[PDB]
């Protein structure tokens, strides 16, 4: 009841702030929901999956994650056996029942507080030692999880690699990149065009390598936070309360969600186009390729063909000179993909390779990706807005990019919400202004 805590029913989970047993319960109960959805969604996707269709023509976002990890697929992304998808769903689903059972138990049946039950699980938010210790344990868990990805790539079948010679395939990662100048060079590239920050990672070696690195970084920091207490400069620079830590993570979860958006929109390495459909830049570049191949077959000389604007119709230069695809796709010349890189010489697209070396599988790939561009209506009509009904399709990339920008934006709002409140609760005016000691009434007047 609201008279006991201060918080109303719509803010009822704030009554959990200093009840560690119930708070543990809700948390473990929530984690079951995530794992539940993961397993449930997978089985739904598998019950609706058709192997003869590409995954991206079928509204699948999880099976693509599983196949990128190397389970279920063969060369060029073709699904060869669906039993590994089945396992991933069943196991998550079965586990969620466990997470649910404990979560509900701690919520309504276990002891409401832990601090009198055990001195190890109990915690006071203002206790900077115990908090860094819990942080340390979880950092250790995160490090292990990042190493499980390494282990799957190096010791347990490998990963799907769209860049693999002969066409993408599952491949075991023998030489992860450990060179800090490469791994942390990604963390220092520009976010802007032609650079890409971490989103530009375009080889499994660099992926596997970076995970070895944060895997080690995390475990070390975990050990470091278990053994130390926060220094004095950190003590006076932060707010030490449950809501304060919740806000710090909302900001982080927000930053991560934006980054996830850009990753699935631009990157076709850890999001294989074989599974997720082409990217935006890719499908546009694929369109230009398709018409280059068609017109050249008719007898056009695509290097010297001038276009209406005077620029080249099929081929122009970039601002740094590189031979790129022409037309409005000029904006997409930073695109890189395995169907197009064979035509790339050192100066950009090689006119001789365009004339003599285009292979049927490339023409097929360009046409497929041109007519599967991530463009569609909310009710999944495929194409520009002016398209008539016929094609039921929205790219998984659109679906994943749009949702996680929404989640990211709202979690940034969440950060601003709980941050300011944490600051006001600690200072003692989160409930409003004391009439008998109004601060402004004691400051001097601006004029």
């Amino acid at each position: 009841d609201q008279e006991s805590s201060g918080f109303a029913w719509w803010a009822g989970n704030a009554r959990l702030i200093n009840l560690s047993g119930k708070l543990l319960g809700a948390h473990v109960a929530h984690a079951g929901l995530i794992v539940f959805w993961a397993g449930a969604m997978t089985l739904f996707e598998l019950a609706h999956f058709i192997p003869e269709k590409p995954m991206y023509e079928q509204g699948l976002i999880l099976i693509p994650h599983i196949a990128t990890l190397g389970w279920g697929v063969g060369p060029g992304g073709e699904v060869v056996d669906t039993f590994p998808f089945f396992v991933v769903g069943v196991v998550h689903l079965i586990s969620s029942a466990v997470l649910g059972f404990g979560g509900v138990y701690h919520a309504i049946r276990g002891p409401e507080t832990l601090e009198e039950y055990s001195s190890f699980f109990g915690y006071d938010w203002k206790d900077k030692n115990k908090m860094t210790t819990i942080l340390g344990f979880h950092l250790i868990v995160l490090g292990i999880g990042a190493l499980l990805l390494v282990a799957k790539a190096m010791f347990f079948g490998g990963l799907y690699d769209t860049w693999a010679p002969g066409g993408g395939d599952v491949r075991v990662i023998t030489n992860p990149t450990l060179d800090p100048r490469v791994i942390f060079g990604y963390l220092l590239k520009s976010p802007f065009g032609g650079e890409g920050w971490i989103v530009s990672v375009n080889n499994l070696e660099d992926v596997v390598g970076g995970h070895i690195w944060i895997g080690l970084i995390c475990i070390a920091g975990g050990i470091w936070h278990i053994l130390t207490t926060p220094f004095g400069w950190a003590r006076r620079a932060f707010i030490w309360s449950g809501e304060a830590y919740l806000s710090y993570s909302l900001g982080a979860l927000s930053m991560m969600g934006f980054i996830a958006t850009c990753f699935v929109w631009f990157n076709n390495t850890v999001y294989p186009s074989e599974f997720y459909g082409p990217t935006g830049p890719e499908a546009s570049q694929a369109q230009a390729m398709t018409f280059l191949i068609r017109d050249q077959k008719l007898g056009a000389n695509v290097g010297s063909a001038q276009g209406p604007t005077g620029l080249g119709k099929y081929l122009m230069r970039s601002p740094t000179g590189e031979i790129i695809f022409g037309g409005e796709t000029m904006r997409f010349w930073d695109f890189r993909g395995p169907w197009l890189e064979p035509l790339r010489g050192p100066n950009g697209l090689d006119l001789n390779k365009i004339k003599n070396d285009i292979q049927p599988w490339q023409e097929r790939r360009a046409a497929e990706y041109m007519t599967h561009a991530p463009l569609g209506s909310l009710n999944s009509v495929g194409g520009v807005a002016t398209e008539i009904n016929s094609v039921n399709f929205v790219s998984p990339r659109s679906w994943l990019a749009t949702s996680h920008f929404v989640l990211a934006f709202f979690f940034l709002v969440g950060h601003l919400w709980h941050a300011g409140r944490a600051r006001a609760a600690a200072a003692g005016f989160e409930k409003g202004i004391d009439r008998e000691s109004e601060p402004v009434l004691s400051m001097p007047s601006l004029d």
């Binding site: 029913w9 539940f36 959805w37 449930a40 739904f44 019950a47 669906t82």
Partner: protein, 35 residues
């Protein structure tokens, strides 16, 4: 789904919505306690 489990493929169509219902139940419950 493997055919030995084809009997549940109606049940699979519903499962992913179960987490949403959990959100709704918290309102049934607060309605039952009069908020």
């Amino acid at each position: 789904l493997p055919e030995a489990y084809a009997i549940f493929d109606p049940l699979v169509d519903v499962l992913p919505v179960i987490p949403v219902l959990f959100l709704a139940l918290a309102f049934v419950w607060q309605a039952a306690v009069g908020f």
